[PDB]
Design a protein around this ligand. Structure first.
Ligand SMILES: [Cl-]
Lengths: 243, 243
């Protein structure tokens, strides 16, 4: 649980006229690195990163049966095109399809949702809002360092849900894989309360180690959204974690 | 019809100066495609493609605890540099580490191995030869279309082992992923009995379909190994399956 601040990464942000935080955790060595200890420990709305615990709970309670169950589009056209189609758990996570996840949350219900999040130690002690809204409207907050602590539990199958639920969600988090590395992760974009931010949280699997990461950054327009991944990958490259 | 022959792809073999087959299977439409209906049905030694059933059997019997268990290098240098290190199930499949897998076969034993392959309906189901080498220089043979038949059952969690064993092995088969597709697959190089061949078998996961593949090509020399993937992706691209 030992930490180093590297202000030198601030350059990856200033390059884009942005502000933000990257937090890395070396699993083998049990050491953390961040450009900004303060912001690393500040709590923000999780927006679509909340689909990770939402997925786990829906699977564990059998709200969702498996990763192939189809959730049919409701016929209402929303302004994100990829939402306007049938989804399973994999594609719902891939395209961050809020309406699907909102239906999951309703079936979970407020009482089980609250208890499972307490079991996960996820988020602030007193959450609030409606069950299908709280994770959007500002009823729950989490810091990049707290995202890492949660992801390390999931990695290790240590959360208070079945092993099966955790394996399925880790499959759903798969984002990139090559001969050098696998990334399992989830993006977020929080717009409903200031400051508007983007998220990318997850890990990098190597042959010999795993690097957990969580980043957030100011995101006043959707124009910068690609920086969530690019800035994280710049830091991974600089740190020789990926080529 | 159910099966369609597309000699068009033969051009990918000769443009890279070799010979072989590709079999594709459309899961949604239950349709098959190959450039050589004949060689598609021809049985060869599975070589390291046998790591898929071997892994499944090892996990299900508890010979292997999970994907993190470490198999320590014995300190003897072998031909392939990447073998000369510690491995877990994920790295052992990535690097095709025969020594690890032989140790599995010995602990499984001839009687359980034979029974399991009967229940998998795997190729000629014949394990005459060394229990720790039959897939390499022994009596077992399998066709590309029998590979696909087996791989379909694995995809659907319908092999006679636990769901957990199947999900772990499908994780271990992860070869490539991006915003376009996921490939789960395993390579094979058979050199001890003629004709020498290369395999690549697995599947391509898309948003709303899965394309199983099984391919084998002549490999008189280890210089063509790279072609196993290259010819398959050439075919995949031509069929508009991957960009
Ligand atoms: Cl996976």
């Amino acid at each position: 649980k030992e930490w180093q601040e590297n202000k030198s990464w601030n350059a990856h942000f200033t390059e884009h006229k942005s502000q933000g935080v990257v937090v890395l955790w070396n699993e083998n060595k049990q050491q953390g690195f961040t450009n900004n200890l303060k912001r690393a420990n500040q709590a923000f709305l999780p927006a679509s990163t909340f689909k990770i615990p939402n997925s786990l709970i829906a699977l564990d309670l059998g709200v969702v049966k498996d990763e192939h169950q189809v959730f049919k589009w409701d016929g209402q056209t929303r302004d994100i095109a990829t939402w306007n189609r049938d989804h399973n758990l994999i594609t719902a996570m891939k395209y961050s399809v809020v309406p699907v996840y909102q239906e999951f949350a309703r079936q979970i219900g407020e009482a089980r949702m609250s208890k499972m999040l307490h079991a996960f130690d996820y988020g602030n002690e007193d959450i609030s809002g409606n069950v299908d809204s709280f994770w959007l409207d500002g009823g729950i907050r989490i810091s990049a360092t707290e995202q890492i602590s949660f992801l390390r539990k999931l990695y290790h199958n240590k959360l208070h849900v079945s092993e099966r639920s955790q394996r399925i969600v880790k499959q759903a988090m798969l984002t990139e894989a090559n001969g050098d590395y696998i990334i399992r992760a989830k993006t977020g974009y929080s717009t409903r309360i200031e400051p508007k931010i983007g998220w990318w949280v997850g890990w990098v699997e190597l042959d010999d180690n795993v690097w957990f990461f969580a980043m957030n950054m100011d995101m006043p327009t959707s124009d910068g959204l690609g920086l969530r991944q690019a800035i994280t990958k710049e830091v991974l490259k600089q740190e020789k974690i990926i080529p």
